[PDB]
């Protein structure tokens, strides 16, 4: 990624401005709920405006920062990709179940993850990536030993370092892992993305066994799904109480959100607290709430 100057941030602002205008089309019927692209892009502009204001007179420091160069490169690519999506999708952007519309929804999630990462690394406009707090002690020790105080590393470097502690059994498994951990879809792993993954799939001691049981082989897990998509996907199971799915919370990154059909005709979503996802799923099955993952009659046996 090349050096980021003030002109490059202004070019991204223009591209984001085009995406905002595309997403103001009333044919989209865009719901004002996270992730909401019409909030995320102006909020990203404002945080970049904040970053630039903290680096007045020291723009050479900001331009050389590796994380910020990777971030701006990804921001330009993602906005260009959204513009191309509208250009090629044409009228299919407004059909609610179309693939081009689903691609826009996934991109909206990516913009939300990117803003969350940017605020985690530049909390008040100043770079603090070297002192980021990985929330699980064992995961923090892994990153420190493998990468010191780095904020971002290429996927290849990350896979190699992880494999030495948690062996990855195959190339296909490594691609599934990458797709899970790389929330910003930039082929890099930030310390912020690593924290999120290791909080979601704790304990560290059995990290990849947990991820395999909760995501790789579990029909209830939904990658890159939003609150509104979970409610929509459960509608077909409104008469099948106990149908449930789960996914990453968008607004509380690092925590799980479980959606389920109640016995009284409601579709509710909850964020487990003070217990790991596996125990929430086990207790929920025993108590009758989480019986049918994605509406399927067989539920995985996690008591093992």
């Amino acid at each position: 990624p090349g050096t980021v100057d003030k002109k490059m941030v202004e070019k991204c602002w223009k591209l984001m401005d085009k995406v905002v205008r595309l997403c103001q089309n009333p044919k989209l019927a865009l719901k004002n709920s996270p992730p909401y692209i019409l909030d995320l892009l102006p909020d990203t502009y404002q945080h970049l405006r904040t970053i630039l204001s903290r680096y007045e007179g020291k723009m050479e420091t900001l331009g050389e920062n590796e994380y910020f160069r990777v971030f701006m490169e990804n921001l330009m690519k993602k906005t260009k990709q959204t513009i191309s999506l509208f250009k090629e999708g044409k009228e299919r952007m407004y059909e609610e179940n179309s693939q081009p519309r689903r691609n826009l929804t996934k991109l909206s999630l990516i913009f939300s993850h990117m803003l969350a990462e940017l605020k985690g690394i530049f909390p008040s406009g100043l770079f603090q990536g070297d002192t980021f707090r990985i929330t699980k002690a064992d995961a923090a020790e892994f990153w420190r030993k493998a990468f010191g105080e780095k904020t971002i590393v290429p996927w290849k470097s990350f896979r190699q370092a992880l494999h030495e502690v948690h062996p990855i059994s195959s190339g296909l498994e490594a691609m599934a892992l990458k797709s899970t951990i790389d929330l910003t879809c930039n082929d890099y792993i930030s310390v912020f993305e690593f924290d999120i993954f290791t909080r979601l799939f704790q304990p560290w001691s059995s990290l990849l066994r947990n991820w395999n049981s909760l995501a790789v082989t579990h029909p209830g897990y939904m990658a890159f799904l939003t609150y509104d998509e979970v409610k929509a996907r459960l509608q077909k199971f409104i008469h099948k109480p106990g149908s449930y799915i789960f996914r990453l919370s968008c607004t509380r990154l690092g925590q799980w959100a479980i959606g389920y059909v109640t016995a009284d005709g409601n579709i509710l979503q909850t964020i487990p607290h003070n217990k790991p996802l596996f125990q929430a799923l086990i207790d929920g099955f025993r108590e009758g709430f989480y019986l049918f993952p994605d509406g399927r009659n067989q539920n995985p046996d996690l008591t093992g």
Binding site: Y260, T262, L268, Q269, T270, P272, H273, A280, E287, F289
Partner: peptide
């Protein structure tokens, strides 16, 4: 989001 069932 609502409390856990």
């Amino acid at each position: 989001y609502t409390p856990e069932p």
